[PDB]
């Protein structure tokens, strides 16, 4: 069995290996990368996502989200308070202001310590889930706006033709902006490219151990757990590495820098934070190996998780018994 300790693997494809996206994912899996729940891919030195980032300031963040925390430093939830629209140039200036900028620090480890000590005492503003792409249309390799769609994968594997679309999303972050513990919708893969700016630290639980994280979360967030049998789908709960280690939960951590791709694998729980002003692009994707994970994915039916149009068909075809209840939660 490859990668039996479920370590995060880092890949350096050549320019020739970077041509065929599906083939390279399957390669990484042949080496056990999925066992970690997360892999890093460093593009060949010949590759670029686009020519420059000098002209992005006029992108609009229609609904910036202020991430307000409640709880204790290592075990907290966050809610998202909507703020007035602002441009990426305005948001960058905000991120760099004395109120929001990254503090002085020695290295990534010191910064990580400061994040876990101090996160809850501040409310950083995140531009999330903005439909669009920063890949140049002429970038042929690993262009997250040109990937094979999940609907076409389901159709290729299972023969059923379904409605829905699959497009990328932009994320503009600042110091302390936080992504809560979650798996993807329908336990899909994700791919995330850090276009510019400061790093993103990730934490991940191996897929084979995901239920250990879920059981800890039910203990740590007992009211939420009573409210919903899949409350991590709400994407609001944070648990620190120290707490995870205290409770024996297997996990790994890695820091993504600008120019690097991360892939999350089906049912790989992940969480993390941004080091300072940055911009990432991410999208879900599928492979044949995902299908069985999609059929088994938990679902929120309490009404909190509310998701895209395109997830309807996935539930309807893969999970027909659950469909009726889940759809009620959507409506």
Ligand X SMILES: O=C(O)CNC(=O)C(=O)O
Q: Is 279 annotated as a binding residue?
A: no
Residue 193 makes contact with ligand X by CB under 6 A: no
Q: Give the Cα-Cα-Cα angle 24, 30, 34 (nearest 5 degrees).
A: 85
Q: What is the DSSP letter of 176?
A: T
302 near Zn ion, rule: CB under 5 A: yes
8 A C-beta contact, residue 37 and residue 59? no
Choice between 17 and 90, CB closer to Mg ion: 90
Among residues 254, 103, 238, 80, the alpha carbon closest in space to that of 174 is found at 103
* Cα–Cα separations (whole angstroms), residue 31 to 13, 35, 179, 193: 13, 9, 28, 22
Binder to ligand X among 76, 171, 290, 326 (CB under 6 A)? Answer: 171
Note whether 298 binds ligand X by CB under 6 A: no
Binding letters toward Zn ion, positions 181-220, x by CB under 5 A: ----------------------------------------
Say if CB 68 and CB 81 are below 8 A apart: yes
Whether the Cβ atoms of residue 264 and residue 204 lie closer than 8 Å to each other? yes
* 228 sits near Zn ion (criterion: CB under 5 A): yes
Q: Is residue 58 part of the contact set for Mg ion (CB under 5 A)?
A: yes
Looking at the Cβ atoms of 10 and 325, the one nearer to ligand X is: 10
Nearest to 39 by CA among 236, 331, 262, 329: 262
> Is 317 a residue that touches Zn ion (CB under 5 A)?
no
Q: Does 300 bind Zn ion (CB under 5 A)?
A: yes
Stretch that binds Mg ion, among 53-61, 124-132, 153-161, 183-191 (CB under 5 A): 53-61
Nearer to Ni ion, 129 or 219 (CB): 129
Structure tokens at 314: 């996935």
- The number of CA neighbours under 13 Å toward the Cβ of 249 is 26
- Kindly give the pairing relationship between strand 86-87 and strand 252-256: unpaired
Minimum CB separation of residue 168 from ligand X in Å reads 10
| Binding-site residue set | 126, 182, 184, 192, 200, 228, 234-235, 270, 300, 302
Query: What is the binding site for ligand X (CB under 6 A)?
Result: 171, 179, 190, 192, 200, 264, 270, 280, 282
Q: Which amino acids are annotated as binding site for 2-oxoglutarate, given as ranges?
A: 126, 192, 200, 235
């Amino acid at each position: 069995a490859q990668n039996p300790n479920c370590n995060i693997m880092i890949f350096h494809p050549t320019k020739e290996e970077f041509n065929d996206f599906d083939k390279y994912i399957a390669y990484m899996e042949s080496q056990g990368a999925h066992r970690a729940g997360l892999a890093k891919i460093i593009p060949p030195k010949e590759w670029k996502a686009r020519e420059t980032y000098d002209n992005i300031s006029e992108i609009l963040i229609a609904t910036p989200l202020q991430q307000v925390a409640s709880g204790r430093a290592g075990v907290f939830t966050q809610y998202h308070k909507k703020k007035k629209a602002m441009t990426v140039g305005e948001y960058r200036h905000l991120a760099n202001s004395k109120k929001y900028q990254t503090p002085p620090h020695q290295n990534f480890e010191d910064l990580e310590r400061k994040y876990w000590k101090n996160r809850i005492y501040n409310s950083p503003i995140y531009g999330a889930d903005i439909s669009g792409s920063l890949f140049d249309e002429n970038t042929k390799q690993w262009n997250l706006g040109h990937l094979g769609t999940i609907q076409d994968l389901l159709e290729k594997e299972c023969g059923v033709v379904i409605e829905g679309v699959n497009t990328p999303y932009l994320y503009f972050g600042m110091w302390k902006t936080t992504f809560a513990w979650h798996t993807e919708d329908m336990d899909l893969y994700s791919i995330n490219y850090l276009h510019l700016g400061e790093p993103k630290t990730w934490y991940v639980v191996p897929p084979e151990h995901g239920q250990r994280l879920e059981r800890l979360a039910r203990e740590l967030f007992p009211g939420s757990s009573r409210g919903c049998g899949a409350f991590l789908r709400h994407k609001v709960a944070l648990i620190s590495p120290t707490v995870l280690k205290e409770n024996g939960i297997p996990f790994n951590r890695i820091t993504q820098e600008a120019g690097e791709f991360m892939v999350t694998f089906p049912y790989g729980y992940h969480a993390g934070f941004n080091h300072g002003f940055n911009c990432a692009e991410a999208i879900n994707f599928a492979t044949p190996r995902w299908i069985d994970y999609g059929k088994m994915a938990s679902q929120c039916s309490c009404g909190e998780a509310r998701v895209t149009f395109s997830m309807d068909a996935f539930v309807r075809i893969l999970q027909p018994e659950r469909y009726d209840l889940w759809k009620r939660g959507q409506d």
